[PDB]
Amino acid sequence: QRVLVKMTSRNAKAVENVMTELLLHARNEKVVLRGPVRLPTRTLKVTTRKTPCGNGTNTWDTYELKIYKRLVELRAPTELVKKITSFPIDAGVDVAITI
Amino acid sequence: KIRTKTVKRASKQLVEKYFSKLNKDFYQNKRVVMDVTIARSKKLKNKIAGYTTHIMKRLARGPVRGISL
Amino acid sequence: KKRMIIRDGVFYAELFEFLKRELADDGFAGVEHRVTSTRTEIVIRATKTREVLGEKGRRIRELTACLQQRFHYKEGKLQLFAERVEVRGLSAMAQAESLRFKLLSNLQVRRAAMGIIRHVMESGAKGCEVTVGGKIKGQRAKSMTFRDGYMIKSGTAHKNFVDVATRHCHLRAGTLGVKVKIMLPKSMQNEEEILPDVIT
RNA sequence: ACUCAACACGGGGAACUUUACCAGAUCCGGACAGGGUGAGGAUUGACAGAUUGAGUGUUCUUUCUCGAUCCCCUGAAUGGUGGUGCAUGGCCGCUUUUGGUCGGUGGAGUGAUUUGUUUGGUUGAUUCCGUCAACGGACGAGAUCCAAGCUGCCCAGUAGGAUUCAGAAUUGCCCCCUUCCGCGGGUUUUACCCAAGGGGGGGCGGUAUUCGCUUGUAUCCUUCUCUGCGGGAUUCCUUGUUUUGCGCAAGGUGAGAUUUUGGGCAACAGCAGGUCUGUGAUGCUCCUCAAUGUUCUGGGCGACACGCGCACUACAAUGUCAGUGAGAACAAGAAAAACGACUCUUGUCGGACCUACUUGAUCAAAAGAGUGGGAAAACCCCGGAAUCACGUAGACCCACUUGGGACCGAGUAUUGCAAUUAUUGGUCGCGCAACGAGGAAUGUCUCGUAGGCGCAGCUCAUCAAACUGUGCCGAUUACGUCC
């Protein structure tokens, strides 16, 4: 492995606060940053009939979720990673998968 | 096609309150409009600014009618 | 993953539900769920706090416990909070609760309806509506509606200015619908769907 | 459920379960104890034999083993896919995809009323403009939202290119342009022109024979990929047409030319439309210990049982790929991860899901087995789809034929606790069973559309001619009217 921080979320304008600002700490602030960035957004798509009984003209609804995914890289910091990560914990339903 | 009365109304107000345009360019006019107005549609801004131009072209001739003295 | 999301989702559902139902007449409105790593912070947003929190904290600690046994948290990995959301008029859910309570206690139709619509439009709401269906007069049901101010009903901009709620009132001789709408003076941040405006 | 708004509809492709229905047996899931039960109490469970569909203590015989709530009797409680959708909530469908709906102030009338919301033009649109006793608002329309086409900034160790160096391999092409002069023919002397030949001028093997997604060294880059937030036109011209107006037609500009394209949303007033088989959504009633409850209990039935009518689907009658054989190229949305057992230490690893390679294969398919990767832009995957293409000297030849298969017998393997009324694959025989372009009548469609073709998701041990979604090949006619 290397140090790979991934960020996943259910909406945009959530990810951007975490990534695109508040990984500031590793950016130009103290140490090197190699920044790759963002990945295929996936769609989770659940088609569902609209009538609670059997009648009608056979209408439907389609519902959707969006996933959002991000990814950034650091070249062996030796427990500066503690600092860098911990400052943004922010926004409900953003999760942070550090490797 | 035909322009709704949202468009028309808005556009009139501008021609009045500003002669920091008089241009027959869609382009020049547009970049005034979008920093003078808040509508939060980019679509509306196009149609407004377009109509504006088609007022100023008329204004260079006889009476426009129904847009002050 | 695809899965982590759905976990958070189904969680948030069940959570919401259990509070909405079993905690009544406090003007329950919303929650929020979030995590900081290795904690869970769930706030609760209801008009009247002194009922929520209990006399000395019995009620809040109660809820805590309930949750922990279901979703299999340890203590100190779950903590709950309360908040007053003041300006009661500008929540659908709040006024839906209140209205329900009165109809269950054998108040009329039009009297009760009006009383809501007052308190709403005094809070500064743009317009509101209220509906009641179900029994009234006797036989063949009936539906009636009461309207004040103005509101939009199309687009996706009635899904960001107008949040609604629907509840039941269980009575003898019929169930009875109730519903309350309420258009806000504000968005969820700011946005106006139309209304072009000239700033001199 | 029964015209349009019943009839591949009730996510309804049901082996058991699911399941309402039928035959038979079982269990309390009868709370709450007011009324009865000494240390044994009232009580629970059972080997064996018998009863029985049942090596089912259901029940009996027999004896052992155990909370005293369990147990006995009335009241009451409860559960129910029982009844009523003409008791009712919620949700959905339809009226209705049409452009419609309402009030304030002012005006006119003694007022029931009207103007606004009207004769006209215009637009998909109560969309605008003109006239004008109306003016200014709110809903619907429009706009805001989602996806598609083009583009800016961003980005790479999961996207993919460039150059250099080494190593490996084939080891060969089944030059050209321009110009001048001469002469013999064709020439009417001549000018002109064709054949042949010679000379001069200019290209040129350029800092390059060609080829490796396992064939490796070095260096560099972001055109092609990904994505968040942003750019991107009724403008311009024809001075045509129109009233100067609202606009309209043709052309231009451009990635895109007129609701740019396809969706989602959608007022007021309603229907005695559907649903009590979605729900700890329910009023009143029905049923309750030999039950209409529970019953994941054993067996049967279910949308399945067979002269016959109807709806929707799929496959054909072949020689416009047409049919069995061969070889070549080639697609994108999407799908997979956790279930108290296991081994790990002191509070947690691996496996239950996909798929590759290899073997099996010193001899059919289907099957079998071992190993490895992937939690998904890393594995599968360079996703080798089918339609399709062929200078493949391929077979076939107009026939119900090698066109089509329906029915029908035998053998075998997998799925599952259970495949018998064949469940699903997979090879032999049955084809001599229909059917040769289809009457009256009738369905929905205007451009990446119609039609043809294939894949995935859905349901889910197993099985899709269905439904939802994505891609490939890709037209004819009209662009009008009110019959």
HEC profile of C20-83? HHHCCCCCEEEEEEECCCCCCEEEEEECCHHHHCCCCCHHHHHHHHHHHHHHCCCCCCCEECCC
Q: Do chains A and B touch (3 or more CB pairs under 8 A)?
A: no
Burial of C128 (0-12, 13-18, 19+ CB in 10 A): buried
Resolution of the solved structure (Å): 3.3
What CATH architecture applies to the domain C1-86? 2-Layer Sandwich (3.30)
Q: What residue type is assigned to position A81 of the chain?
A: V
* CB within 8 Å: C36 and A93: no
The CA distance from B25 to C32, in Å, is 51
Q: Which residues contact C33 (CB under 8 A, 6 or more apart)?
A: A92, C8, C11, C12, C15, C40, C41, C42
Do residues C40 and C77 make contact, with C-beta atoms less than 8 angstroms apart? Answer: yes
Question: Measuring CA to CA, which residue among C35, C32, C41 is closest to residue C78?
Answer: C41
The residue of chain C nearest to residue B12, with distances taken between CA atoms, is C198
- CA atoms of A36 and A20, how far apart (whole Å): 11
Distance, CA of C130 to chain centre: 14
Q: Is C7 exposed, middle or buried (0-12, 13-18, 19+ CB in 10 A)?
A: exposed
**For strand D, which nucleotides have at least one atom less than 7 Å from a protein CB?**
1, 5-7, 9-11, 87-94, 122-125, 127-130, 138-145, 154-158, 226-229, 231-236, 244-248, 258-260, 264-267, 269, 272-275, 278, 281-284, 333-338, 340, 375-377, 468-469
CB-based contact C80:C44 (threshold 8 Å) = yes
> Half-sphere exposure (CA, 13 Å, Cβ side) for C193?
15
Name the residue among B6, B36, B41 with its Cβ closest to that of C198.
Answer: B36
Q: Identify the CATH number of the domain defined by range A1-99.
A: 3.30.70.600
**Distances, alpha carbon B54 to alpha carbons A49, A76, B6, B24, B47, in Å:** 50, 63, 16, 8, 11
Contact between C34 and A44 using a beta-carbon 8 Å cutoff: no
Domain ranges within chain A, ordered by starting residue: 1-99
Chains sharing 3 or more CB pairs under 8 A with chain C: A, B
Q: Please state, in angstroms and rounded to a whole number, the distance separating the CA atoms of residues C147 and A54.
A: 34
Q: Inspect the interface and report whether the beta carbons of B6 and C191 lie closer than 8 Å.
A: no
List all chains that touch chain B, counting a touch as 3 or more CB pairs closer than 8 Å: C
Report the CATH architecture of C87-200: 2-Layer Sandwich (3.30)
DSSP conformational letter for B12: H
Q: Where are the domains of chain C?
A: 1-86, 87-200
Q: Is C112 left (phi over 0), alpha (psi -120 to 50) or beta?
A: alpha
Contact at CB, B37 and C196, closer than 8 angstroms: yes
The structure tokens listed for B69 are 């003295």
How far away is chain C from the Cα of A92, in angstroms, using its nearest Cα? 4
Work out the burial of residue B7: count CB atoms within 10 Å of its CB; fewer than 13 is exposed, 13-18 middle, 19 or more buried. Answer: middle
The b/e string for C38-53 (b: 16+ C-beta within 10 A; e otherwise) is eebebebbbbbbebbb
Distance CA(B64)–CA(A38), nearest Å, equals 54
**Nearest chain A residue (CA) to C31:** A92
Q: C164 and C92 in contact (C-beta within 8 Å)?
A: yes
